[PDB]
Symmetry: D3
Subunit: 265 residues, 6 copies
C-alpha cells in the first residue's frame, strides 16, 4: 500500500540522481570548445546535486522547485538536439540517446504533476511503461555496443543481441497498445509479454553489472564508464519495479536509488 | 491545388475499395463454423461494394455520412474479432496484429471523413504522421507474405523477411524523429532524407508485390496468399507513397492507389 | 516382443486420431464458400471419429474398413492439392503441409497392408522413418513459424531453428540411404545420426508442449491451436518410438495416442 | 529430333570423360599407403581414358556393353571405398557423400546404357527426375569448393556456401513437388517456374565455376582444388542444364558438356 | 620516376595534414575536465597546422628534422593517452584501438622521415608492408563509423559493419601470405590477385566515405561523426591505394591523398 | 620453479611428437604421384620417431641433432608451400595449414636456441603465445570445418564458431601488442583477455576430444582422423600451459605430451 511520503522520497531520489547523471554525462560529452553548453551542463550538475542533497520528508513545495529544474534541463537537452539536427554542436552523444534523456525527464515531470499536488503518483497501465522504457533499454544496449573498442567483439555481439530483443519487444508493445481499442485492457498475452520482458531485463541487469565491473577494473576497452553502467542498471531496475507493480508480478531485488559500488558508505 | 470534388472522390474510392477487400479477406479467413461472423463479413462485403460503386459527384457530403456509419461498424467488427482472438473465442486465419492494422486503416478513413462530411478538403498531414501509420502496415504486409508462402518458397521468404526488417527499422527511426519534433523544428534534413529512403524502399516493395501478384495469377507460387491480396497491398503502398510525395515535397509516384493493372473488367 | 492385438489397437488408435485431426484441420481451413469440400471434410471428421470409437480387440475386418476410409481421405487431400496447383480452391493450408498429410495417410496404409492380413506390422529400417518423418517435423516447425503473429519474434526464431535442424537432418538421411548401396545396412554413423535426431525430437516435443500451453492460456498470438500442437507432439512421439525400436534405443516417455490436456478423463 | 548415332556418341563421351575424371580424382585423393586401391584407380584411369577415345560410330551397341561392364566395376569400387570409410578402413581425401554422388552419377550412365545396348535412343526423363539427381550433386559441388578453399579465402567461401544453400533449398522443393505428382498432374505452373529458377541458378553457378577454374589455372586462389575439378563440375552442370531445357521446354544452354574451354589440346 | 622534391613535398603535406587532423580529433574528443591534455592537443593542432603550411621546396632536409621532432612528440602524447585509458585515468571519446591506429600512422611518417632527413627518396615498400599497416586501419575506420552512427541508422551501420568484416578478413589473409614469404618467393600470383581485390574494396569504401561525408555536410545522417573525419579517412585510403598501385604494379588511383573535394577554401 | 632437465625432456617430447605428426600428415596428404616428396615425408617420419625414442636425461648435444632435423623439415614445408604457390604439387593440405606447421617448427627452434646452450627456455610474454597460437587454433577449427562431410552441418557450425572466435581473439592480440609501445607491459585488459582466451581453449579442447571419439568410433563422416584431433588437443594444451605460466593463471589439467587414447600402455 503506497503512501505520499515514501513514494515522494523514492521518486525524488531516483529521478534527481538520474538527472544529475544526465547533466554529468552531457558535460563530459561536449567538446572543450562548447563553452556555453559546458557552463549550462555544469549548472545542471550543481543544481540536481543540490536538490538531491536537500530532499527530505518535509515536500510539496520541494516538488515545485524540482519541477522547474526538470523543465529547464529538458529545454537544454532539446536545444542540444536542435543544434545536432542543424550541424551546430560537437557532442559525443547521438541525437537519439539525448532523445531518450528527454523521454526520461518527461516521466519525472509526469510524476511531479501528482507530487506537487500532494497526491501519490499512480502506477500506470503496464503498457505505458513498456512504451517508454523498451526503446530506452534498446538505446542502452546500443550505446554499449557503440562505446566498445573495435576489438571487443564478444561483448558487442552480446549487447547487439539485447538491442534487438528490446526493439522486438517495443514493436510487440506498440501492437498490443492497439489491441486496447477492444476495451479489453488486460488479457493473457499482455501479462505473458510483461513477464517475458521482465526476464530479459533481469538478464540485461546482470550484463550491465558485469560491464560495470569490467569498467571498474579497466578490464574492458571502451569509452563507457562504470557510472554509466550503474545509471543504466538503476533505470532498468525502476522499470522492473513499475512492471511488477503494474502487472502483479514478484518485486525485483535491486535498488533503483543506488548501485552496489557507486556510493561512499 | 487539391479541390473538394476530386479529393473526396479519390479518398472514397481508395478507402471503400480497401474496406471491401478487408471484409472479403475476413470472410474468407473465418472457419466455416463461425456462422455469425461469416454473416457479418458478408454483410460487410455487400455494404462496401455497394458504397464503392455508389460514390459520385452527386450529394458527396451526405454520402460521407453513410460511408462514415459503415466504417465505424466494420471497425467495431474488427475490434470484436480481435477481442475474441485474445480470449480464444474464434477461429480465423488472420493473426491479431494483421487485423489490428486493418483497424489502423479504417481509422485513417474515419479521420479523412471528418473533413469530407464538413465539405472540406482533408489536409495533407506532416509526413511523420504517414510514417507512423504506414510503416508498421508495410512490415505487416511483408510479414504476412512471408508467413503465407509454402515451406519450400525459401527464396521468396528470404526476400519478404528482408522487407519486413527494413520497414520495422524505418519505423524505429520514425518513432525517434517524432520525438525530435519536441524541439519545435518540424522539418530538418535528416527527416527529408528519411522520407526519400522510405520512398525508395516502397518502390522496391511495390515491384516485389507486383511480382507476387503475377506469380499468384499464374499459379507459379505455392502459398495461401491470393493475387487480390498482393494487389491490395500494392494499392496501399501507392497511397502511402502518394501522401509522402505531397507532404514531403517529392516527385509524385507512378502508380494508381485505386485500381491495379489486373483486377478490373475493362 | 510385439503382438498382433496390441500392435493393431495401438496403430488404429494412433492413426485414426491423426486422420480425425486432419479432417478437422482441413474443415476449419476451408473458406466458407468451399461448400463441396466442407461437406467432404465434415464427412471425414464423422467417419474417422466413428471408426476410432469402434476400435476393439475383436480387427482384421475392421482394418479393411479403416483402409477404405484412409484411401478416401488420401484422394480428398490430393484433390485439394490438385486444385491448389490450378488456383481452384481457397484453403488456409499450403500445398506442402497437405502433401505431408498425404505422406502420413500413406504410412497408415502401409501398416494396414499387414494388419488386414492379421500380421504384426514390422518395425522398418530406421532410415525409412527418417525419410518420412524428418520433412514432416520440418513442416511442423515451419507451420508454427508461419502461424505466429508478426510480433512473436522470439517464438518464430525458435521454430525457424527447428525447421532448419530437421531439414539438415533430412539431407543427411538422404545421403545415408545412398550409403546403403554398399550393402552395409547398419554402421556407426547411422546409429549416431538416429540418436542425434532423437535428442532434437525430444527438444522439439518440449517446444510443442510449451506452445500448446501458450495456446490453451491465450498467451501466444497466432492462428495455431492447442489441438494442432497436441497433434504435432503425438506424431513426434510415434516417430521417436519407431526410432527407439528400429535402432535399439531407450523408449521415449510420451504417449502417441493422447496428450496431457486434450482428453475428457 | 534425337537420333541414335548422335545421342549414343554424346552420352558416351560425356559419361566416359566424367568417369575418367572420377577415377583420376580418387587416384589422387588416396593416401600413398593405400597401394591396392591406388592400383585399382589407376586401372580405372587407364580403362575410361581408353573407352573415352575408343567410342565412335562403329559397333556402338557392342561398345555399350563394354562401357557398361566398366561402369559397374567402377561403381563397385566406389561403393567399396564408401564401405571402408564407414568402417574406418581407408585413408582417402574425399568425404563419403562426395563419393556417394559419384555413385549417383555412374548409375545415371548405367540407366542410359540400358537403352544404348538395345540400340535405342534413351528418352528424356520428366524434369523432376533430373532435379532429384542433380540438385544434391550441385550442392555437393559447391560444398566441396567451400571445403577445399584455404582458411583465408573467405569471400570465395561465402559465395560457394550461398550456392550450396540454394541448391539444398531447391532440392527440398523438388522433393515436395515430386509428391504433388501423386495428384496425377505431372506438369503444372509451379513446376515449370521451379525449373526456370533452377536453370538461372545453374547459369550463375557455371560462371562461378568458370571463375574458379581460371583462378586455379593462374594459381591466384589458395586451395586444394584443381582447375580440372572445376571444369568437371561445369561440364556436369551443363549436362543438367541441357536435360532440363529438353525435358521442361526451355532454351538450350550455351555450354558444352563434353569439353571445357581450357582442358583440350587443339 | 620519383624525385626528391616532389616525393618530399607530397609526403609532408599528406602526413602533416593527417597529424593536424589527429590532434584536432583528440582535442574535440577530450572531456572538458581534461585541461592538461586539452592544452597539449591544442598545441598539437597549432604545431602541425603551422608545419603543414610551412613546408615548401626551400630547406626541405632541415624541414624534415623539425617535422620529425613534432611527430615524435605527438606519438608520445598518443601513447600517453592510451596508457591512461588502460589505467582508467582519462576521459576521452576515442577507444584505445583507434588511438593505437593513430600511432601506427605517425610511425609510418617517421619511417618516411628517416629517408627525407637524409635527402633521399623514400622507397616504395613491398605491397604486403602496406597491407599489414592499412588493412587494420581501414577496418578501424569502418568500425568507427559503425560505432559513431545513431541507434536508428541501421542501414548505414549494416554497410559499415560489412566493410569492417572484409577489411579484417583481408588482414588475416595478408598475415598468412606474409608467412608464405618465408619461402623466399616474394611475388606470386595469389599475392597480386589479393592486392587487386583489396584495391577494389578500397574503391568501394572510398565511395561510401564520400557518401558519408556528404550526409554529414547536409546534416542528413544522425551521428557523432563529422564530415572532416570522413574526408580524413578517404584521404588515407587514397594514400594506401596509391602505394599499392606503385608497389604492386596497378593503375594509379583517381583520388587526391592531400585534399578532399569539400574541405578547402579556393 | 622450472629446471633444465625437466623443461628439456618436456619440450623435446612435446615437439618431436608434433613434428612426427606433421611428417605423417604430410605423407598421407601427398598424392601417390608425388614420389619425391613422399620419400622426403617418410624420411621425416623415421627421423622424428627415432629422435623421440632416443630422448633421455643425458641433452645439450641431443638438442643440436634435434635442431638440424627441425630446420630440415622446416625447409621441406616451405618447399611444399612454394610449389603450392606455383601450381607444382598435389597435396591435400592448404598453404595456410602448412604455413601454420612452419610457425610451429619455428617455435621449437626458438626453444632449441636455449636448450642447446643448456639454458632453461624462458616463459615469453603472454602476447607472444597469443600471436602464435591464436591463428593456429583458428586454422585448427577451420580444418575441422573443411574436413567434415557436407552433411555434418551441426558439427560444421560448431567449428565455424570456434574459427571465428579465435580469429577475433587474434585481432585483439594484434592491437594489444600495439598498446605495449606505451611501455606498460601488463595491464588489466590484457590479463582478462588471456583469461577469456583460456576459457575458449578449454571449450575447444572439449570439442576436439568429442571429435576424436567420433572419429575413433566412425560416428562422424569426414576426412579427418582421430590422430589429427589428438594432435590439435595436445597443441591447445601446450598453449594453455604457456598462458597459465606466462600470465599467472591456474595450470590446465591436460597433457601436451600424450592424449587419453593414442598410446600403447
Ligand atoms: Fe538515463
Ligand atoms: Fe536511459
Ligand atoms: Fe489493408
Ligand atoms: Fe494494409
Ligand atoms: Fe498430421
Ligand atoms: Fe505431421
Ligand atoms: Fe562427377
Ligand atoms: Fe558431380
Ligand atoms: Fe588517421
Ligand atoms: Fe586512419
Ligand atoms: Fe601441429
Ligand atoms: Fe597446429
Amino acid at each position: 500500500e503506497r503512501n505520499y511520503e515514501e513514494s515522494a522520497l523514492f521518486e525524488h531520489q531516483f529521478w534527481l540522481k538520474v538527472l544529475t547523471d544526465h547533466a554529468q554525462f552531457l558535460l563530459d560529452a561536449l567538446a572543450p570548445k562548447e563553452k556555453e553548453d559546458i557552463k549550462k551542463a555544469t549548472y545542471f550538475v550543481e543544481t540536481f546535486t543540490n536538490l538531491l542533497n536537500k530532499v527530505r520528508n518535509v515536500l510539496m513545495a520541494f516538488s515545485k522547485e524540482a519541477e522547474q529544474a526538470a523543465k529547464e534541463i529538458r529545454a537544454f537537452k532539446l536545444n542540444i538536439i536542435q543544434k545536432q539536427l542543424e550541424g551546430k554542436i560537437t557532442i559525443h552523444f547521438t541525437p537519439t540517446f539525448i532523445n531518450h534523456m528527454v523521454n526520461e525527464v518527461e516521466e519525472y515531470i509526469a510524476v511531479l504533476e501528482f507530487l506537487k499536488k500532494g497526491e501519490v503518483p499512480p502506477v500506470f497501465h503496464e503498457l505505458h511503461y513498456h512504451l517508454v522504457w523498451l526503446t530506452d533499454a534498446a538505446g542502452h544496449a546500443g550505446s554499449i555496443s557503440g562505446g566498445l573498442d573495435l576489438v571487443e567483439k564478444r561483448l558487442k555481439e552480446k549487447s547487439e543481441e539485447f538491442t534487438k530483443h528490446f526493439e522486438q519487444f517495443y514493436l510487440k508493445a506498440v501492437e498490443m497498445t492497439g489491441y486496447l481499442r477492444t476495451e479489453l485492457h488486460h488479457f493473457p498475452a499482455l501479462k505473458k509479454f510483461t513477464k517475458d520482458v521482465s526476464l530479459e531485463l533481469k538478464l540485461f541487469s546482470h550484463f550491465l553489472h558485469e560491464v560495470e565491473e569490467l569498467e571498474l577494473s579497466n578490464e574492458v576497452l571502451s569509452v563507457l564508464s562504470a557510472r554509466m553502467a550503474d545509471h543504466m542498471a538503476r533505470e532498468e531496475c525502476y522499470y522492473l519495479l513499475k512492471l511488477a507493480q503494474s502487472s502483479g508480478l514478484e518485486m525485483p531485488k535491486c535498488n533503483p536509488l543506488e548501485g552496489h559500488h557507486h556510493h561512499h558508505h
